[PDB]
Design a protein around this nucleic acid. Structure first.
Ligand SMILES: NC[C@H]1O[C@H](O[C@H]2[C@H](O[C@@H]3O[C@H](CO)[C@@H](O)[C@H](N)[C@H]3O)[C@@H](O)[C@H](N)C[C@@H]2N)[C@H](N)[C@@H](O)[C@@H]1O
Ligand SMILES: [Mg+2]
Ligand SMILES: [Mg+2]
Ligand SMILES: [Mg+2]
Ligand SMILES: [Mg+2]
Ligand SMILES: [Mg+2]
Ligand SMILES: [Mg+2]
Ligand SMILES: [Mg+2]
Ligand SMILES: [Mg+2]
Ligand SMILES: [Mg+2]
Ligand SMILES: [Mg+2]
Ligand SMILES: [Mg+2]
Ligand SMILES: [Mg+2]
Ligand SMILES: [Mg+2]
Ligand SMILES: [Mg+2]
Ligand SMILES: [Mg+2]
Ligand SMILES: [Mg+2]
Ligand SMILES: [Mg+2]
Ligand SMILES: [Mg+2]
Ligand SMILES: [Mg+2]
Ligand SMILES: [Mg+2]
Ligand SMILES: [Mg+2]
Ligand SMILES: [Mg+2]
Ligand SMILES: [Mg+2]
Ligand SMILES: [Mg+2]
Ligand SMILES: [Mg+2]
Ligand SMILES: [Mg+2]
Ligand SMILES: [Mg+2]
Ligand SMILES: [Mg+2]
Ligand SMILES: [Mg+2]
Ligand SMILES: [Mg+2]
Ligand SMILES: [Mg+2]
Ligand SMILES: [Mg+2]
Ligand SMILES: [Mg+2]
Ligand SMILES: [Mg+2]
Ligand SMILES: [Mg+2]
Ligand SMILES: [Mg+2]
Ligand SMILES: [Mg+2]
Ligand SMILES: [Mg+2]
Ligand SMILES: [Mg+2]
Ligand SMILES: [Mg+2]
Ligand SMILES: [Mg+2]
Ligand SMILES: [Mg+2]
Ligand SMILES: [Mg+2]
Ligand SMILES: [Mg+2]
Ligand SMILES: [Mg+2]
Lengths: 146, 260, 124, 185, 159
RNA sequence: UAUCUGGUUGAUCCUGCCAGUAGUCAUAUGCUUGUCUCAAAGAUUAAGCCAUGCAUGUCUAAGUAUAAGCAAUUUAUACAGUGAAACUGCGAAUGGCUCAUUAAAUCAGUUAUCGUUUAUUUGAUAGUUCCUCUACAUGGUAUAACUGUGGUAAUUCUAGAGCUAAUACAUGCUUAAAAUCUCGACCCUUUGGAAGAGAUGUAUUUAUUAGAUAAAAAAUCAAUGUCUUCGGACUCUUUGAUGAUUCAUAAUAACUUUUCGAAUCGCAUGGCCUUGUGCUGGCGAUGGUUCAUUCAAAUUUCUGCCCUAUCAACUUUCGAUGGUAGGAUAGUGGCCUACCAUGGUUUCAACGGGUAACGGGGAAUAAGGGUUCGAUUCCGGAGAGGGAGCCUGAGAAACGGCUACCA
RNA sequence: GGACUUUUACUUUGAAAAAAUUAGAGUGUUCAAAGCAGGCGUAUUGCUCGAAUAUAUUAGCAUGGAAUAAUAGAAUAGGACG
RNA sequence: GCCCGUCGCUAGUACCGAUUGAAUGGCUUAGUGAGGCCUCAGGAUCUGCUAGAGCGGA
């Protein structure tokens, strides 16, 4: 989730083809490009007032949300700009006419403009492959009880 | 699998072809063409299996090689050619003109239409899009691409196509109280009015339908084809008008007219 | 890779092979109707099992169920067309009381003797 | 050859996977053209479905756009200066995307001293008509202008010489020229 | 019986991977390459036969060679090859110049000749005429519906 | 279609298993065998080894005939019937076979492509082409078959000499009008003008711009275009699809070992007037760039596998989880590389071991709940003695294709 | 007039759902297993019914219900409405 | 009456066991390493354009 000072990286962070002319003096030192996510997901304020780049961001980045939309509790924040959801569910064993507690751990990419921690039930949506385990992107966040 | 499958095992054929279990290992495997293969009717099923004009597949080609069959106005020579919904199939000597249109049981039905009305067909616009050079265009279910259409034609609208020139002539919008043909699913073959289109963002908008008998049923939007205005079909419907009699009601009509 | 030709066996064997009372009754049915072997008895005990089963399954469904009415009647309509079910026994509760001789009675075997033509089941 | 499949990788839980099938062409990878600075040498590559691609292994002379001025010129590409991924690409003067190379100025100086009538950082009315109107637009960054003295401009390759066969870029301006000028020092 | 391969040097046989458009292999199918023994380019006593071709002729006549001259089997076929053969002009209408050959049945000498290709014919000039007309005709009709739509657009903006 | 019965005691009631009983798409075997219909069949063991033969080739009116082929008889003096061989094109990546591998894999149901390639089919789509005299009434070589000279015990081995074609190969002409953009000789000084020179098909690469619009109204700096009661008036200011995009589409400046823009073929022989081999002209074929469609493909979401803890920790040398950049791919992506973090899985059983394990549709048994099975007719997967490599091509990591190692 | 599940589980209806096979409708293959055939009439140029229907929900999608069973909220007010 | 264990005979089953005992299949360390592909080169022999000398192409 955490982010640097903007340009920490050996390569220049910027958004693609978003150009601000040095011949034309401006107020905002850097043009910023955002987009509406869709599905009624409200691109939050931190998205438009930040300096962060994160091309994997659902807003401000080049990924797009399509496919399944999942909700789950956030069990590990420890990675950088990605986290781990624990989705819980109850599986049916027909012979015994009862259920068994199972679970699945989903890595998802948490854009800056979201500050997430363990607790923190999270909505997440299918973005296309990001890295090798990551198919989902943080979209909406709900609070923690503790 | 290393490339295109060129064979269709019989029993993997579409069931609406109504091909018998025995008689061969294979089915016709429609060619690539205007219709999607599970949704089409290869000319050989029409001529030999439906119309009974040919017996062998060998005869089917003999007929076609003579140019005795047109589809949508052009000579089609391909044994497996994939004719489908709203196609024409004009057999000139024999003076017969048909249109491929669904049973109430889901099956492409033999339907004889006049010498006119063979002169046109109804395409349902699939996408509308802006081509290069600035020219917009419209694409239909049958794969027809027509530049320079009405700007009021939208995706899911239907279209009247001339077939001599191509050339869309008028059109119907997609909205409530329109007359609708169900092109797939459980209700394939039913005809009816609209009522409600329940939309869902992200996919699969449902269209609720009500037929002449005040029966209601739903399919997906994709399965809905716009054929005209209520009680006012723009093409000749086949017998029974997509009514869906119950199995009991079917039994009564059978033994009503058979016997007395 | 030709479509498979489906088939089914037409008869069933009894659970207890040695029963005096059941082996007599089967002999009787053999002699009255001119039967060949127990298998012919058996084939009919089978048909009856299938028809009583479909009836049972219909009678647990609420009356005026479209399935109960549609399949109920058709079952009864075929049983009458052969002369197994009487001109009115026509409710489903009655097919459940139907038994084997009712079927055995309708054999072209037994009809050739029933009206003239024979003067025996074995002549028949 | 090079396979791009995921099945050869361990799974997320870290278990080792057993080989399912033999490598398939449609997962094929290829060897990198390390494009260099020299006489133009470009080989085609017949890729999936017909579809030539172009490996540029030796190049000079490519197209660079001056974004603020709205024009593009074709220049020499003197050398490579920086590179974020691997400093060996700077050592070996390898042309890849995100290059940060120096290029010839003189096609850019020739277009400025024509278009704007001025010089860089030291008649015929219709010509003087345009020169006067276009002024007040004649001031560019001091960080850029100072480069023209040396004859070479800092630019960054925007294309993929290994794919297009073109080494193409844009001359470094704006905040981005500050960043790289700071790394360069 | 292994052939020599030009320019492989060596006085021996090696095993090479051979392609299309390379001597000593005829690929049996498309993209097929084969590994075959081939004999070096350098002469040694192990050659069964050495094939040479006369460059500059010597003093005395070689009996089966300098004496008898043997004919080309076919004459020109393409138009300008006939022209290049006889030294004709662009205006010269090859036609009646082409070579014919006599063949007897048992009782009937008949003649036969090639079919000149790249011949400038009434049919060919007609095909050019049809396509040209097709181009300009369609290009105008493509403007027609195009300005016609532009009006219907301004007419729906009124609607 | 919800059933039992025999065996422990002198006897008795239990526990409890052994025995009997019934089916088996379940295989073998033994003894017996007349008719009709139907028909599984070298899976189990040895994805062990194979003699021989066969299983992949293909021509229309319509790419190439000087067969020293055949028949003809043309109207025939360019060619014209039929037609071997060979070129060229296409197919051989379909089928058929098997179940070895494979246990989060495959597979099923369900998604994804705003994450891509797609011969072909079907529908669309092309006036722009080194013009610092130049064939466009049509450029150029080069080969096969063939002829003849040869090598080898031997093969669908081929050398060297001579001929000759194309829808092979290699080249290369072009057609209206306008408008808009730079440069600018000169008009002369003013709200100041412009002759004429170039550039502009498509595609390729990059940068830049537009693609608007959730309710309104002014101010200025710069630049700039259209009216003029000639002072300034200013115009009600033209814009698609999606839940969503940097989308479709368009503009600017350029870039390119410059992609495509018919030197192709078959039937017809009509019409104009200056009658010239003039000009024009019909129905088809085969091509050709882009787009769509169709037949596909490649990844992909969600949930779901048998026995085992006498497998409890596993993963990161040598990529393990993630970040940035690049490279690569058709394309996403640790697919790979450089740098940087230290993550990722696990008693809700990870990881490992076993399977006499390909998955599924389905099969047997028939109160119900369940138990057992599914090599094998359909779908999907995998392989072609074992591995790996790769050529051609839209498509193969092919095996009745090649290369190599092992056997 | 169109749009609240705080967040679920649960339950209803529906869509989307290959054929074969299973259940089952129709049909005298001479019966039957089967098959998807066929049935009339002058048999002189014909007419015509069929090739239903039911069925996994584990999971997903759409949906009606809010009992049961969980769950979130104002307490150092840092609460709600304006 | 029942009834236990050593000892002794016969047959069958597994077990411990020197033998660094053996076999087959998977995964491997390290050294070596076939082959094609990419790439730097090489240029047998052929060709184009501007007696000559020159600039390219396969
Ligand atoms: N070579 C294999 C075949 O050999 C026999 O064929 C019989 C033949 O079956 C043929 O095959 C078809 C498929 O089985 C039948 O449907 C046809 N009616 C018939 O033409 C029978 O109609 C004859 N009465 C006997 C003949 N020996 C076997 N008995 C078949 O079972 C078997 O498949
Ligand atoms: Mg915005
Ligand atoms: Mg049939
Ligand atoms: Mg929607
Ligand atoms: Mg049945
Ligand atoms: Mg350097
Ligand atoms: Mg020709
Ligand atoms: Mg006792
Ligand atoms: Mg005893
Ligand atoms: Mg006793
Ligand atoms: Mg006793
Ligand atoms: Mg037992
Ligand atoms: Mg007989
Ligand atoms: Mg029979
Ligand atoms: Mg044998
Ligand atoms: Mg075997
Ligand atoms: Mg296959
Ligand atoms: Mg395991
Ligand atoms: Mg699937
Ligand atoms: Mg050009
Ligand atoms: Mg004009
Ligand atoms: Mg704006
Ligand atoms: Mg150019
Ligand atoms: Mg080129
Ligand atoms: Mg004259
Ligand atoms: Mg798939
Ligand atoms: Mg990347
Ligand atoms: Mg990639
Ligand atoms: Mg990365
Ligand atoms: Mg196995
Ligand atoms: Mg089952
Ligand atoms: Mg029981
Ligand atoms: Mg199986
Ligand atoms: Mg096996
Ligand atoms: Mg088998
Ligand atoms: Mg394979
Ligand atoms: Mg074998
Ligand atoms: Mg094969
Ligand atoms: Mg292989
Ligand atoms: Mg073989
Ligand atoms: Mg039935
Ligand atoms: Mg029957
Ligand atoms: Mg549920
Ligand atoms: Mg309680
Ligand atoms: Mg012993
Ligand atoms: Mg030893």
């Amino acid at each position: 989730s955490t982010e640097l000072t903007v340009q920490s990286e050996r390569a220049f962070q910027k958004q693609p083809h978003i150009f601000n002319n040095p011949k034309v003096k401006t107020s905002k030192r850097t043009k910023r490009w955002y987009k509406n996510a869709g599905l009624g997901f409200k691109t939050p304020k931190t998205a438009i007032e930040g300096s962060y780049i994160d091309k994997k961001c659902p807003f401000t980045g080049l990924v797009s949300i399509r496919g399944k939309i999942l909700t789950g509790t956030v069990v590990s924040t420890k990675m950088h700009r990605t986290i781990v959801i624990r989705r819980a569910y109850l599986h049916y064993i027909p012979k015994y006419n009862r259920y068994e507690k199972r679970h699945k751990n989903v890595p998802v990419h948490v854009s800056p403009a979201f500050r997430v921690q363990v607790g923190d039930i999270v909505t997440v949506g299918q973005c296309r492959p990001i890295s090798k385990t990551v198919r989902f992107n943080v979209v909406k966040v709900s609070a923690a009880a503790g | 699998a290393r490339g295109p499958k060129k064979h269709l095992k019989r029993l993997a054929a579409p069931h609406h072809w109504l091909l018998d279990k025995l008689s061969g290992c294979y089915a016709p495997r429609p060619s690539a063409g205007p219709h999607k293969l599970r949704e089409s009717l290869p000319l050989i099923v029409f001529l030999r299996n439906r119309l009974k004009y040919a017996l062998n597949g060998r005869e089917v080609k003999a007929i076609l090689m003579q140019r005795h069959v047109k589809v949508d106005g052009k000579v089609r020579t391909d044994t497996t050619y994939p004719a489908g919904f709203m196609d024409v199939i004009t057999l000139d000597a024999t003076n017969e003109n048909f249109r491929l249109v669904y049973d109430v049981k889901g099956r492409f039905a033999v339907h004889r239409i006049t010498d006119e009305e063979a002169s046109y067909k109804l395409g349902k616009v699939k996408k509308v899009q802006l081509g290069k050079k600035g020219v917009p265009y419209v694409v239909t279910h049958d794969g027809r691409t027509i530049r320079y259409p009405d700007p009021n034609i939208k995706v899911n609208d239907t279209v009247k196509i001339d077939l001599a020139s191509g050339k869309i002539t008028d059109f119907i919008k997609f909205d409530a109280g329109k007359l609708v043909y169900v092109t797939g699913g459980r209700n394939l073959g039913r005809i009816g009015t609209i009522v409600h289109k329940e939309r869902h963002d992200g996919g699969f908008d449902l269209v609720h339908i009500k037929d002449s008998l005040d029966n209601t049923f739903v399919t997906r939007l994709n399965n809905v084809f716009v054929i005209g205005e209520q009680g006012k079909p723009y093409i000749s419907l086949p017998k029974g008008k997509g009514i869906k009699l119950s199995i009991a009601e079917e039994r009564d009509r059978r033994r009503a007219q058979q016997g007395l | 890779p030709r479509a498979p030709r489906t088939y089914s066996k037409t008869y069933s064997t009894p659970k207890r092979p040695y029963e005096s009372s059941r082996l007599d009754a089967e002999l009787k049915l053999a002699g009255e109707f001119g039967l060949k072997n127990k298998k012919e008895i058996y084939r009919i005990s089978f048909q009856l099992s299938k028809i009583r089963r479909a009836a049972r399954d219909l009678l647990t469904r609420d009356e005026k169920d479209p399935k109960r009415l549609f399949e109920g009647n058709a079952l009864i309509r075929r049983l009458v067309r052969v002369g197994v079910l009487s001109e009115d026994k026509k409710k489903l509760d009655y097919v459940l009381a139907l038994k084997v001789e009712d079927f055995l009675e309708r054999r072209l075997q037994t009809q050739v003797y029933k009206l003239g033509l024979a003067k025996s089941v074995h002549h028949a | 050859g090079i396979s791009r499949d995921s099945r050869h990788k361990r799974s997320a839980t870290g278990a080792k996977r057993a080989q399912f099938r033999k490598k398939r062409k449609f997962e094929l990878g290829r060897q990198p053209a390390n494009t260099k600075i020299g006489a133009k040498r470009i080989h085609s590559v017949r890729t999936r479905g017909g579809n030539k691609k172009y490996r540029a292994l030796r190049i000079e002379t490519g197209n660079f756009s001056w974004a603020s001025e709205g024009i593009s010129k074709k220049t020499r590409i003197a050398g490579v200066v920086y590179h974020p991924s691997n400093n060996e690409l700077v050592r070996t003067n390898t042309l890849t995307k995100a290059a940060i190379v120096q290029i010839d100025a003189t096609p850019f100086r020739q277009w400025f001293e024509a278009h704007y009538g001025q010089t860089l950082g030291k008649k015929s009315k219709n010509a003087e008509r345009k020169w006067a109107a276009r002024a007040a637009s004649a001031k560019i960054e001091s960080s850029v202008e100072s480069q023209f003295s040396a004859g070479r401009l800092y630019a960054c390759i925007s294309s993929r010489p290994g794919q297009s066969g073109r080494c193409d870029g844009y001359i470094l301006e704006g905040e981005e020229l500050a960043f790289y000028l700071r790394r360069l020092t | 019986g292994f052939p020599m391969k030009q320019g492989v040097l060596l006085p021996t046989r090696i095993k090479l991977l051979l392609t299309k458009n390379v001597s000593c292999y005829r690929p049996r199918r498309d993209g097929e390459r084969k590994r075959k023994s081939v004999r070096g380019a350098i002469v040694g006593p192990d050659l069964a036969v050495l094939a040479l071709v006369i460059v500059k002729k010597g003093e005395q006549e070689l009996e089966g060679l300098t004496d008898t001259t043997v004919p080309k089997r076919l004459g020109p076929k393409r138009a300008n090859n006939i022209r290049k053969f006889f030294g004709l002009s662009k205006e010269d209408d090859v036609r009646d110049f082409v070579i014919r050959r006599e063949v007897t049945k048992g009782e009937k000498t008949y003649t036969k000749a090639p079919k000149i290709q790249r011949l400038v014919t009434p049919q060919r000039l007609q095909r050019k005429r049809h396509q040209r007309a097709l181009k300009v005709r369609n290009a105008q009709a493509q403007r027609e519906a195009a300005a016609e739509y532009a009006q219907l657009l301004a007419k729906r903006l009124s609607e």
